[PDB]
Amino acid sequence: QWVDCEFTGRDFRDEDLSRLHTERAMFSECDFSGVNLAESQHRGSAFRNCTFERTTLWHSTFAQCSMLGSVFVACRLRPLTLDDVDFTLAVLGGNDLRGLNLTGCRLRETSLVDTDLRKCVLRGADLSGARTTGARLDDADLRGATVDPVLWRTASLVGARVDVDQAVAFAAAHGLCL
Amino acid sequence: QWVDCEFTGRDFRDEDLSRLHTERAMFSECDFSGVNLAESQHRGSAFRNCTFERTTLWHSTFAQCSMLGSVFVACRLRPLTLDDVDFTLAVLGGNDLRGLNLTGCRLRETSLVDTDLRKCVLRGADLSGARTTGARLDDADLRGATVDPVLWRTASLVGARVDVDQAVAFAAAHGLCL
Ligand SMILES: [Cs+]
Ligand SMILES: [Cs+]
Ligand SMILES: [Cs+]
Ligand SMILES: [Cs+]
Ligand SMILES: [Cs+]
Ligand SMILES: [Cs+]
Ligand SMILES: [Cs+]
Ligand SMILES: [Cs+]
Ligand SMILES: [Cs+]
Ligand SMILES: [Cs+]
Ligand SMILES: [Cs+]
Ligand SMILES: [Cs+]
């Protein structure tokens, strides 16, 4: 258990940190490449501008945690239990996030380039400023999520679930004039 | 002036009928191929299942007239003054109708295949059952018009003006789930 402490510029590479429990641990610029972090549990922690390359995070829990600015490259992120996790400014490009429940999660200015979010639950999520080029949102649930008009012409949306507002914004994003 | 009379299966081909005035003239199955009908004026008349091939109808006026079932092939239809003209079941495929004001006109089960309706005013029009394959509705005004979901994936709509309902139906026609 790492409780009420910080870690800055620490190199945790290729370590086995499975089942780690943290509470109010603030990590800044820590390197978690090749780290095995399966079955870990986090509550109130922050992983700020950290590097997650090929990090294994599946079967984990993050509650009220921040991931602001962190970069995730080819990470195993499913399944995963998230409750109010801030992904603002984070880089999730190219990862497979299919099926993850991301209700009300902040993804402001998050990079979602070529990220697979198929069937993801994004109700009430905030995607203001996210980069969605090549993003796959098929069969995902977006109702009440705040999204920019650019998303409507960048992500694939077959079967995506939306509210009236989004449908209207989709329509205007494809050249119709309201 | 042809007033309160009928004409059935009449052959009017290649006749000069320019400036003709009719009032409650009922034409059924009349052939108007190659006919010049420019500057004509019609009020309360019917042109039912008539044939209009290469007929010249520009600079004309039709008020409360019916065109039910008539076939129009390469006709000059612009400009034109229409007020409540019924085009139900009519064949307007391939004609250039650009810019025509068609407010509240019925186009139920009308064939609009490859018809150019760019910039047309179709407010309050009824297009239930129209066939819109290759139809061009760019910069046209559709607000309050009743249209089938199939129109949203068949006609070109760049800049078309729509209300909230149509935008929503456009959205659902492209795979989004409301
Ligand atoms: Cs361990
Ligand atoms: Cs802090
Ligand atoms: Cs949860
Ligand atoms: Cs969640
Ligand atoms: Cs916003
Ligand atoms: Cs911003
Ligand atoms: Cs004449
Ligand atoms: Cs009649
Ligand atoms: Cs008129
Ligand atoms: Cs009109
Ligand atoms: Cs209808
Ligand atoms: Cs019908």
Tab-separated table of C-alpha atoms and ligand atoms in Angstrom:
chain	number	residue	atom	x	y	z
A	1	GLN	CA	0.000	0.000	0.000
A	2	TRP	CA	1.312	3.375	-1.017
A	3	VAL	CA	-0.651	5.901	1.006
A	4	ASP	CA	-0.400	9.708	1.233
A	5	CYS	CA	2.939	10.095	-0.549
A	6	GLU	CA	4.343	11.242	-3.909
A	7	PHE	CA	6.616	9.888	-6.551
A	8	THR	CA	8.238	12.142	-9.088
A	9	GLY	CA	10.334	11.134	-12.112
A	10	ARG	CA	10.516	7.603	-10.737
A	11	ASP	CA	11.418	4.727	-13.026
A	12	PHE	CA	9.204	1.726	-12.373
A	13	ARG	CA	10.044	-0.100	-15.584
A	14	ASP	CA	9.194	-3.731	-16.137
A	15	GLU	CA	8.415	-4.130	-12.468
A	16	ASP	CA	5.775	-6.500	-11.178
A	17	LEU	CA	3.421	-4.144	-9.297
A	18	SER	CA	0.407	-6.458	-9.510
A	19	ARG	CA	-2.196	-6.033	-6.731
A	20	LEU	CA	-0.741	-2.716	-5.720
A	21	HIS	CA	-3.079	-0.586	-3.561
A	22	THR	CA	-2.721	3.161	-3.449
A	23	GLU	CA	-4.607	5.852	-1.662
A	24	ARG	CA	-3.796	9.467	-2.395
A	25	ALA	CA	-0.534	8.562	-4.082
A	26	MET	CA	0.559	11.306	-6.431
A	27	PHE	CA	2.787	10.136	-9.257
A	28	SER	CA	4.309	12.743	-11.567
A	29	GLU	CA	6.390	11.844	-14.603
A	30	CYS	CA	6.818	8.240	-13.483
A	31	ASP	CA	7.753	5.631	-15.991
A	32	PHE	CA	5.541	2.516	-15.937
A	33	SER	CA	6.736	0.873	-19.137
A	34	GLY	CA	6.406	-2.879	-19.265
A	35	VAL	CA	5.017	-2.780	-15.759
A	36	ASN	CA	2.575	-5.400	-14.689
A	37	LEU	CA	-0.159	-3.570	-12.661
A	38	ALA	CA	-3.006	-6.094	-12.930
A	39	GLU	CA	-5.533	-6.279	-10.081
A	40	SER	CA	-4.307	-3.034	-8.620
A	41	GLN	CA	-6.612	-0.662	-6.714
A	42	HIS	CA	-6.504	3.098	-6.675
A	43	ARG	CA	-8.581	5.629	-4.962
A	44	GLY	CA	-7.866	9.344	-4.934
A	45	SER	CA	-4.517	8.910	-6.637
A	46	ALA	CA	-2.968	10.815	-9.516
A	47	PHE	CA	-0.805	9.578	-12.396
A	48	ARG	CA	0.177	12.809	-13.969
A	49	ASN	CA	2.125	12.993	-17.219
A	50	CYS	CA	3.300	9.442	-16.574
A	51	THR	CA	4.314	7.061	-19.315
A	52	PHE	CA	2.397	3.801	-19.749
A	53	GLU	CA	3.886	1.794	-22.560
A	54	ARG	CA	2.712	-1.772	-22.853
A	55	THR	CA	1.685	-1.479	-19.245
A	56	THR	CA	-0.735	-4.161	-18.096
A	57	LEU	CA	-3.586	-2.503	-16.139
A	58	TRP	CA	-6.452	-5.007	-16.627
A	59	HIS	CA	-8.711	-6.153	-13.816
A	60	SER	CA	-7.887	-2.952	-11.924
A	61	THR	CA	-9.899	-0.325	-10.092
A	62	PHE	CA	-9.516	3.455	-10.237
A	63	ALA	CA	-11.875	5.593	-8.230
A	64	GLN	CA	-11.691	9.379	-8.193
A	65	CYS	CA	-8.255	9.144	-9.768
A	66	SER	CA	-6.534	11.500	-12.134
A	67	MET	CA	-4.541	10.428	-15.216
A	68	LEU	CA	-4.061	13.949	-16.510
A	69	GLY	CA	-1.486	14.092	-19.271
A	70	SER	CA	-0.441	10.489	-19.066
A	71	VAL	CA	0.530	8.644	-22.261
A	72	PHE	CA	-0.743	5.082	-22.766
A	73	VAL	CA	0.779	3.113	-25.614
A	74	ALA	CA	-0.396	-0.492	-26.340
A	75	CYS	CA	-1.674	-1.033	-22.877
A	76	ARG	CA	-4.062	-3.775	-21.762
A	77	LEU	CA	-6.941	-1.829	-20.388
A	78	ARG	CA	-9.717	-4.313	-20.364
A	79	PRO	CA	-11.551	-5.086	-18.440
A	80	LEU	CA	-11.243	-2.187	-16.005
A	81	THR	CA	-13.276	-0.629	-13.239
A	82	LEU	CA	-13.342	3.167	-13.368
A	83	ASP	CA	-15.397	5.670	-11.221
A	84	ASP	CA	-14.866	9.351	-12.007
A	85	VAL	CA	-11.371	9.206	-13.486
A	86	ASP	CA	-9.993	12.247	-15.111
A	87	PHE	CA	-8.328	11.562	-18.510
A	88	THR	CA	-7.998	15.237	-19.398
A	89	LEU	CA	-5.026	15.788	-21.751
A	90	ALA	CA	-4.159	12.079	-21.716
A	91	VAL	CA	-2.980	10.149	-24.793
A	92	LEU	CA	-5.028	7.061	-25.409
A	93	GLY	CA	-4.348	6.841	-29.133
A	94	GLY	CA	-4.430	3.409	-30.687
A	95	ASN	CA	-5.508	1.533	-27.496
A	96	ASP	CA	-8.300	-1.022	-27.349
A	97	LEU	CA	-10.848	0.238	-24.868
A	98	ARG	CA	-13.830	-1.697	-26.182
A	99	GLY	CA	-16.736	-2.152	-23.762
A	100	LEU	CA	-15.297	-0.068	-20.978
A	101	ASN	CA	-17.870	1.889	-18.919
A	102	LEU	CA	-16.644	5.514	-18.942
A	103	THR	CA	-19.765	7.225	-17.625
A	104	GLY	CA	-19.230	10.874	-16.816
A	105	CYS	CA	-15.499	10.508	-17.350
A	106	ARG	CA	-13.632	13.573	-18.477
A	107	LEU	CA	-11.809	13.076	-21.759
A	108	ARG	CA	-11.222	16.757	-22.415
A	109	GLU	CA	-8.392	17.346	-24.892
A	110	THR	CA	-7.762	13.611	-24.745
A	111	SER	CA	-6.201	12.068	-27.799
A	112	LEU	CA	-8.417	9.209	-29.054
A	113	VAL	CA	-6.666	8.791	-32.417
A	114	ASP	CA	-7.343	5.314	-33.775
A	115	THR	CA	-8.630	4.260	-30.364
A	116	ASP	CA	-11.185	1.455	-30.335
A	117	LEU	CA	-14.063	2.538	-28.043
A	118	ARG	CA	-16.639	0.258	-29.605
A	119	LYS	CA	-19.630	-0.428	-27.382
A	120	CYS	CA	-18.071	1.794	-24.712
A	121	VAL	CA	-20.463	3.478	-22.333
A	122	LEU	CA	-19.775	7.267	-22.532
A	123	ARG	CA	-23.015	8.670	-21.078
A	124	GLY	CA	-22.494	12.083	-19.605
A	125	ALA	CA	-18.788	11.973	-20.577
A	126	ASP	CA	-17.032	15.186	-21.552
A	127	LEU	CA	-15.092	14.943	-24.818
A	128	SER	CA	-14.579	18.669	-25.419
A	129	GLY	CA	-11.473	19.087	-27.560
A	130	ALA	CA	-10.712	15.296	-27.880
A	131	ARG	CA	-8.917	14.265	-31.055
A	132	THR	CA	-11.052	11.564	-32.694
A	133	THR	CA	-9.395	10.916	-36.052
A	134	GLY	CA	-9.732	7.093	-36.727
A	135	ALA	CA	-11.654	6.672	-33.456
A	136	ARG	CA	-14.125	3.905	-33.464
A	137	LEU	CA	-17.323	4.632	-31.529
A	138	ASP	CA	-19.605	1.944	-33.109
A	139	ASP	CA	-22.358	0.724	-30.877
A	140	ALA	CA	-21.088	3.047	-28.107
A	141	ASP	CA	-23.469	4.953	-25.828
A	142	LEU	CA	-22.983	8.791	-26.076
A	143	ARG	CA	-26.174	10.205	-24.630
A	144	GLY	CA	-25.588	13.395	-22.630
A	145	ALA	CA	-21.840	13.271	-23.382
A	146	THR	CA	-20.496	16.683	-24.400
A	147	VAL	CA	-18.871	16.316	-27.828
A	148	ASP	CA	-17.467	18.663	-30.439
A	149	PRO	CA	-18.973	18.847	-33.909
A	150	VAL	CA	-15.699	17.452	-35.344
A	151	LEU	CA	-16.317	14.122	-33.694
A	152	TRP	CA	-19.418	13.625	-35.927
A	153	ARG	CA	-17.227	13.517	-39.054
A	154	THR	CA	-14.203	11.670	-37.684
A	155	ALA	CA	-15.252	8.682	-35.604
A	156	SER	CA	-17.154	5.697	-36.982
A	157	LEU	CA	-20.598	5.697	-35.374
A	158	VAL	CA	-22.634	2.721	-36.647
A	159	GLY	CA	-25.312	2.080	-34.111
A	160	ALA	CA	-23.899	4.590	-31.607
A	161	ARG	CA	-26.661	5.751	-29.175
A	162	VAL	CA	-27.295	9.489	-29.024
A	163	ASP	CA	-29.722	12.098	-27.750
A	164	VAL	CA	-31.616	14.632	-29.951
A	165	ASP	CA	-28.904	17.284	-29.652
A	166	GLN	CA	-26.148	15.071	-30.901
A	167	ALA	CA	-28.309	13.823	-33.835
A	168	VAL	CA	-28.883	17.491	-34.747
A	169	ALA	CA	-25.141	18.291	-34.442
A	170	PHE	CA	-24.379	15.155	-36.576
A	171	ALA	CA	-26.762	16.512	-39.176
A	172	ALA	CA	-25.110	19.956	-39.202
A	173	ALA	CA	-21.641	18.351	-39.311
A	174	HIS	CA	-22.621	16.660	-42.629
A	175	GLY	CA	-23.651	19.898	-44.348
A	176	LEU	CA	-27.279	20.393	-43.372
A	177	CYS	CA	-28.330	23.835	-42.353
A	178	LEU	CA	-30.405	24.254	-39.273
B	1	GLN	CA	-59.673	30.117	-73.130
B	2	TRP	CA	-60.739	26.590	-72.376
B	3	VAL	CA	-63.276	26.851	-69.579
B	4	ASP	CA	-65.385	24.195	-67.817
B	5	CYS	CA	-64.766	21.357	-70.273
B	6	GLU	CA	-62.779	18.108	-70.546
B	7	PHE	CA	-60.356	16.554	-72.933
B	8	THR	CA	-59.653	12.859	-72.887
B	9	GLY	CA	-57.040	10.950	-74.907
B	10	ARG	CA	-56.513	14.042	-77.040
B	11	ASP	CA	-53.358	14.404	-79.098
B	12	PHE	CA	-51.977	17.921	-78.859
B	13	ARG	CA	-48.541	17.098	-80.227
B	14	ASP	CA	-46.117	19.755	-81.360
B	15	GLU	CA	-48.864	22.338	-81.253
B	16	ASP	CA	-48.241	25.957	-80.381
B	17	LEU	CA	-50.493	26.455	-77.329
B	18	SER	CA	-48.548	29.431	-75.972
B	19	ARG	CA	-50.562	31.866	-73.806
B	20	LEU	CA	-53.347	29.372	-73.393
B	21	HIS	CA	-55.725	30.165	-70.499
B	22	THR	CA	-57.730	27.438	-68.848
B	23	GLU	CA	-60.164	27.423	-66.007
B	24	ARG	CA	-61.484	24.123	-64.730
B	25	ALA	CA	-60.297	22.272	-67.807
B	26	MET	CA	-59.882	18.594	-67.074
B	27	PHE	CA	-57.384	16.837	-69.309
B	28	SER	CA	-57.024	13.064	-69.015
B	29	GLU	CA	-54.452	11.079	-70.964
B	30	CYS	CA	-53.725	13.968	-73.321
B	31	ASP	CA	-50.521	14.014	-75.245
B	32	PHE	CA	-48.578	17.294	-75.011
B	33	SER	CA	-45.317	16.177	-76.585
B	34	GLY	CA	-43.302	18.885	-78.261
B	35	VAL	CA	-46.026	21.335	-77.361
B	36	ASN	CA	-45.137	24.917	-76.769
B	37	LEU	CA	-47.176	26.044	-73.684
B	38	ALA	CA	-45.115	29.054	-72.573
B	39	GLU	CA	-46.906	31.914	-70.797
B	40	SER	CA	-49.988	29.819	-70.270
B	41	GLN	CA	-52.279	30.294	-67.253
B	42	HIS	CA	-54.175	27.642	-65.377
B	43	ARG	CA	-56.429	27.793	-62.453
B	44	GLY	CA	-58.420	24.870	-61.112
B	45	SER	CA	-57.469	22.640	-64.014
B	46	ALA	CA	-56.290	19.044	-64.058
B	47	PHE	CA	-53.701	17.338	-66.269
B	48	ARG	CA	-54.158	13.781	-65.259
B	49	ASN	CA	-51.905	10.995	-66.506
B	50	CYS	CA	-50.959	13.232	-69.424
B	51	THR	CA	-47.687	12.958	-71.274
B	52	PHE	CA	-45.321	15.940	-71.321
B	53	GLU	CA	-42.272	15.136	-73.370
B	54	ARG	CA	-40.032	18.041	-74.219
B	55	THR	CA	-43.013	20.232	-73.533
B	56	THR	CA	-42.166	23.887	-72.998
B	57	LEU	CA	-44.036	25.154	-69.899
B	58	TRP	CA	-41.795	28.045	-68.741
B	59	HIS	CA	-43.140	31.424	-67.693
B	60	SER	CA	-46.481	29.782	-66.889
B	61	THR	CA	-48.895	29.897	-63.979
B	62	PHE	CA	-50.702	27.000	-62.308
B	63	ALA	CA	-52.953	27.718	-59.378
B	64	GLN	CA	-54.877	25.009	-57.552
B	65	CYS	CA	-54.149	22.665	-60.436
B	66	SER	CA	-53.661	18.941	-60.436
B	67	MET	CA	-50.946	17.096	-62.398
B	68	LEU	CA	-51.676	13.729	-60.836
B	69	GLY	CA	-49.948	10.921	-62.683
B	70	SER	CA	-48.578	13.027	-65.476
B	71	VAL	CA	-45.174	12.163	-66.966
B	72	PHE	CA	-42.736	15.002	-67.709
B	73	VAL	CA	-39.681	14.137	-69.763
B	74	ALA	CA	-37.056	16.843	-70.592
B	75	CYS	CA	-39.453	19.660	-70.116
B	76	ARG	CA	-38.554	23.325	-69.638
B	77	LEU	CA	-40.065	24.099	-66.309
B	78	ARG	CA	-38.287	27.201	-65.264
B	79	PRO	CA	-39.152	29.646	-64.298
B	80	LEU	CA	-42.697	28.753	-63.265
B	81	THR	CA	-45.374	30.113	-60.986
B	82	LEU	CA	-47.109	27.432	-58.928
B	83	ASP	CA	-49.720	27.820	-56.077
B	84	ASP	CA	-50.969	24.583	-54.523
B	85	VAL	CA	-50.380	22.197	-57.419
B	86	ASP	CA	-50.781	18.552	-56.839
B	87	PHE	CA	-47.919	16.432	-58.289
B	88	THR	CA	-49.036	13.245	-56.559
B	89	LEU	CA	-47.937	10.172	-58.565
B	90	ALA	CA	-46.333	12.350	-61.247
B	91	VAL	CA	-43.032	11.505	-62.970
B	92	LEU	CA	-40.568	14.336	-62.798
B	93	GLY	CA	-37.452	12.204	-63.141
B	94	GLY	CA	-34.439	13.820	-64.725
B	95	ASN	CA	-35.996	17.327	-65.095
B	96	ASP	CA	-34.283	20.552	-64.085
B	97	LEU	CA	-36.465	22.222	-61.500
B	98	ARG	CA	-33.780	24.341	-59.867
B	99	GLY	CA	-34.996	27.349	-57.873
B	100	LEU	CA	-38.674	26.653	-58.258
B	101	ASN	CA	-40.836	27.628	-55.247
B	102	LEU	CA	-42.848	24.491	-54.382
B	103	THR	CA	-44.145	25.517	-50.966
B	104	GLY	CA	-46.729	23.137	-49.582
B	105	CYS	CA	-46.880	21.285	-52.881
B	106	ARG	CA	-47.818	17.645	-52.749
B	107	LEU	CA	-45.179	15.378	-54.246
B	108	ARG	CA	-46.549	12.182	-52.751
B	109	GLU	CA	-45.335	9.087	-54.606
B	110	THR	CA	-43.763	11.458	-57.111
B	111	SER	CA	-40.751	10.168	-58.956
B	112	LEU	CA	-37.824	12.587	-58.463
B	113	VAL	CA	-35.140	10.258	-59.850
B	114	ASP	CA	-32.147	12.299	-60.973
B	115	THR	CA	-34.248	15.452	-60.755
B	116	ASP	CA	-32.364	18.673	-60.066
B	117	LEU	CA	-34.229	20.528	-57.277
B	118	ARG	CA	-31.251	22.559	-56.146
B	119	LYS	CA	-32.169	25.667	-54.181
B	120	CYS	CA	-35.844	24.756	-54.585
B	121	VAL	CA	-38.180	26.001	-51.900
B	122	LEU	CA	-40.011	22.920	-50.477
B	123	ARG	CA	-41.248	24.291	-47.135
B	124	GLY	CA	-44.275	22.430	-45.924
B	125	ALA	CA	-44.176	20.183	-49.028
B	126	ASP	CA	-45.292	16.573	-48.739
B	127	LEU	CA	-42.815	14.080	-50.202
B	128	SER	CA	-44.239	10.918	-48.627
B	129	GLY	CA	-43.283	7.984	-50.836
B	130	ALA	CA	-41.316	10.085	-53.438
B	131	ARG	CA	-38.501	8.260	-55.201
B	132	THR	CA	-35.343	10.327	-54.658
B	133	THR	CA	-32.532	8.207	-56.086
B	134	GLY	CA	-30.019	10.682	-57.742
B	135	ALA	CA	-32.177	13.631	-56.641
B	136	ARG	CA	-30.298	16.764	-56.001
B	137	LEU	CA	-31.620	18.837	-53.093
B	138	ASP	CA	-28.488	20.999	-52.424
B	139	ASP	CA	-29.203	24.367	-50.942
B	140	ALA	CA	-32.950	23.579	-51.058
B	141	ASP	CA	-35.313	24.612	-48.256
B	142	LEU	CA	-37.084	21.570	-46.632
B	143	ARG	CA	-38.330	22.905	-43.325
B	144	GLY	CA	-41.708	21.444	-42.335
B	145	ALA	CA	-41.796	19.302	-45.502
B	146	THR	CA	-42.887	15.733	-44.755
B	147	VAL	CA	-40.147	13.396	-46.002
B	148	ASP	CA	-39.381	9.703	-45.717
B	149	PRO	CA	-36.218	8.493	-44.021
B	150	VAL	CA	-35.007	7.111	-47.389
B	151	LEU	CA	-34.645	10.598	-48.766
B	152	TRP	CA	-31.861	11.291	-46.194
B	153	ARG	CA	-29.621	8.655	-47.812
B	154	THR	CA	-30.511	9.179	-51.469
B	155	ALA	CA	-30.589	12.866	-52.342
B	156	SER	CA	-27.562	15.154	-52.169
B	157	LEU	CA	-28.200	17.683	-49.404
B	158	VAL	CA	-25.238	20.085	-49.122
B	159	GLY	CA	-26.509	23.173	-47.428
B	160	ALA	CA	-30.154	22.045	-47.542
B	161	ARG	CA	-32.201	23.863	-44.823
B	162	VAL	CA	-34.026	21.649	-42.341
B	163	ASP	CA	-35.872	21.686	-39.038
B	164	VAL	CA	-34.852	19.694	-35.900
B	165	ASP	CA	-36.973	16.676	-36.833
B	166	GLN	CA	-35.410	16.214	-40.209
B	167	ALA	CA	-31.863	16.603	-38.761
B	168	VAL	CA	-32.766	13.850	-36.267
B	169	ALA	CA	-34.201	11.621	-39.043
B	170	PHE	CA	-31.019	12.314	-41.132
B	171	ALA	CA	-28.983	11.171	-38.160
B	172	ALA	CA	-30.993	7.949	-37.750
B	173	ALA	CA	-30.843	7.313	-41.518
B	174	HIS	CA	-27.002	7.231	-41.266
B	175	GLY	CA	-26.916	4.578	-38.535
B	176	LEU	CA	-27.223	6.521	-35.296
B	177	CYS	CA	-29.550	5.171	-32.697
B	178	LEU	CA	-31.927	7.510	-31.009
C	1	CS	CS	3.282	-7.848	-6.583
C	2	CS	CS	-1.735	17.089	-5.516
C	3	CS	CS	-17.977	1.786	-11.272
C	4	CS	CS	-17.612	4.319	-15.010
C	5	CS	CS	-17.876	22.519	-24.784
C	6	CS	CS	-8.875	24.118	-24.440
C	7	CS	CS	-50.948	30.527	-79.408
C	8	CS	CS	-63.006	16.167	-62.185
C	9	CS	CS	-47.234	31.762	-55.925
C	10	CS	CS	-45.388	27.859	-54.556
C	11	CS	CS	-45.969	10.183	-43.877
C	12	CS	CS	-48.931	4.842	-50.689
